[PDB]
């Protein structure tokens, strides 16, 4: 499914680290004046037109580069663009709502109506451009047994290290909101997590913890986990809700590799129903992945 | 006791800032330096050294720092922003640092409530009596002024870091809204602004 495509970096932009999807290079007309400046990165599939390439290179406002990627994942596309322009970080993903470019690459990764860029709130929670990690509570951080418990109390230390370095903490466990909330309360994690996934929740013990799963779209022509194999789109949307419109890389840590929708990194852990000292090794793996990303963009 | 140890650490940080000031080797106190408009070079050097000191603290592993910066000491009201005595603009690739010298001078000249307030302290009269029977300096006001300037430049340096890391757009947006750094430490620990809290209430 190797597909050729073009990417352009604006040589003088107002909004940085933001990418816009176009069905073709000609879509720039839809931006016209004082809109292109808000998308310093432009991505669009390539139609093998040398005259189009000539036009693009003549467009001195843009630095062009061509790369190929499978037509099924933002991961390869984003890796290619980020290595091309040496940008470890990505801004909010924008699309031309007037002319939605239907690329199978996306299929529920993330997006935004282009015109909403200016409305974005730059202020965020963590200084710099933190990483993001999503944890599937069930048997990943706790014990699958009924009387759930932290499989390895080193979970607290690992989360504190994540926070100290700077990295958004997200939970997505495919259980009842009440189940996950009470699991947090029992294992005394609670405030560790920036985002929680399973009007948010009201029990007189919590104010707002589980953003209501209002977004429903079934599947994008893929037979898999009934609910979903997790949702980069939903998690990044909640990041933006939490004022996080930038991130360095995203890692999904869970007890089930099947979900693994599209994440810059993934970590699998045992479906262990009883406590065991292994989360230190899992934390070692996660920090190794983070360091690997840091190596990819060490220069 | 413990809190006293953190107090000692904070005072040590202030003392390090004092070492930086001595390295600068200014004849006059910062109050007089700021009062003297002609000392534009001294003011710029003070600001730059404070910024570098804060950068080293905020990034202990990083010793590098911008070794050249355009500076402009502003005096007119229209050349200053309330609540941001220090600003970091860009003149099309040129990094300009604007300074509100009148505001700095005003803050420094403000009388401090050193004696006025009474606060808990080591007051064991038995120890004092036992001691009695067994038997270049900085004032509290100067220390307060110096802390005020350090914290001002800390705010300025945080805005500068937003500017460099994110860009001029986000720097302006931060100037408008400061909510980005309610969390602060999340590096930051070495910044005194992360050591206390200040609030305003309707009354």
């Amino acid at each position: 499914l190797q597909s050729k495509w073009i990417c352009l970096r604006l040589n003088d932009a107002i909004i940085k680290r933001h990418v816009l999807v176009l069905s073709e290079y000609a879509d720039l007309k839809y931006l016209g004046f004082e809109k292109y400046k808000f998308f310093e990165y432009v991505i669009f599939q390539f139609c093998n037109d040398p005259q189009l390439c000539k036009i693009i290179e003549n467009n001195y406002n843009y630095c062009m580069q061509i790369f190929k990627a499978p037509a099924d994942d933002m991961r390869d596309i984003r890796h290619n663009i980020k290595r091309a322009f040496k940008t470890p970080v990505l801004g909010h993903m924008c699309v031309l709502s007037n002319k939605p470019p239907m690329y199978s690459f996306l299929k529920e990764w993330f997006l935004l109506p282009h015109y909403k860029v200016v409305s974005l709130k730059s202020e965020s929670l963590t200084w710099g451009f933190p990483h993001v990690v999503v944890f599937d509570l069930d048997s990943t951080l706790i014990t699958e047994e009924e009387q759930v418990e932290i499989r390895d109390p080193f979970v607290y230390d690992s989360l504190q290290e994540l926070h100290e370095m700077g990295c958004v903490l997200v939970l997505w466990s495919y259980g009842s909101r009440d189940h996950v909330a009470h699991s947090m309360r029992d294992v005394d994690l609670e405030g560790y997590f920036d985002i929680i996934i399973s009007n948010a929740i009201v029990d007189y013990n919590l104010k707002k913890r589980f953003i209501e799963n209002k977004f429903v779209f079934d599947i994008h022509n893929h037979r898999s986990d009934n609910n979903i194999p997790k949702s980069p789109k939903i998690v990044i949307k909640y990041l933006s809700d939490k004022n996080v419109n930038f991130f360095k890389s995203i890692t999904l840590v869970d007890d089930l590799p099947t979900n693994n929708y599209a994440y810059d990194f993934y970590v699998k852990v045992k479906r262990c129903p009883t406590p065991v000292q292994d989360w230190e090794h899992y934390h070692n793996e996660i920090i190794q992945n983070i360091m690997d990303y840091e190596q990819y963009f060490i220069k | 006791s413990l809190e006293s140890y953190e107090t000692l650490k904070i005072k040590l940080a202030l003392s390090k800032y004092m070492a930086m000031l001595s390295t600068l080797e200014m004849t006059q106190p910062l109050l007089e330096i700021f009062r003297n408009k002609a000392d534009t070079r001294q003011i710029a050097a003070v600001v730059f050294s404070t910024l570098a000191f804060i950068h080293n603290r905020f990034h202990p592993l990083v010793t590098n720092f911008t070794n050249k910066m355009e500076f402009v000491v502003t005096e007119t009201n229209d050349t200053s922003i309330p609540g941001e005595p220090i600003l970091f603009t860009e003149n099309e690739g040129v990094l300009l640092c604007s300074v509100d010298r009148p505001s700095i001078v005003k803050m420094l000249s403000r009388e401090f409530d050193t004696e006025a307030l009474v606060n808990f302290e080591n007051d064991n009269c038995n120890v004092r009596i036992a001691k009695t029977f067994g038997a270049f300096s900085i004032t509290e006001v100067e220390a307060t002024q110096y802390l005020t300037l350090l914290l001002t430049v800390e705010h300025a340096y945080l805005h500068y870091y937003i500017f460099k890391n994110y860009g001029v757009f986000e720097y302006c947006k931060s100037l408008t809204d400061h909510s980005l750094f309610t969390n602060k430490l999340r590096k930051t620990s070495n910044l005194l602004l992360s050591k206390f809290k200040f609030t305003i209430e309707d009354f």
Binding site: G191 | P82, H155, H178, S179, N183, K184, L193, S194
Partner: peptide
């Protein structure tokens, strides 16, 4: 002096410190 409105909550945010859980 500038006759500009003041954002009390934003000033509080300037000097706002979050507290961790440990």
């Amino acid at each position: 002096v500038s006759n500009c409105k003041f954002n009390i909550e934003d000033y509080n945010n300037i000097f706002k410190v979050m507290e961790n859980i440990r």
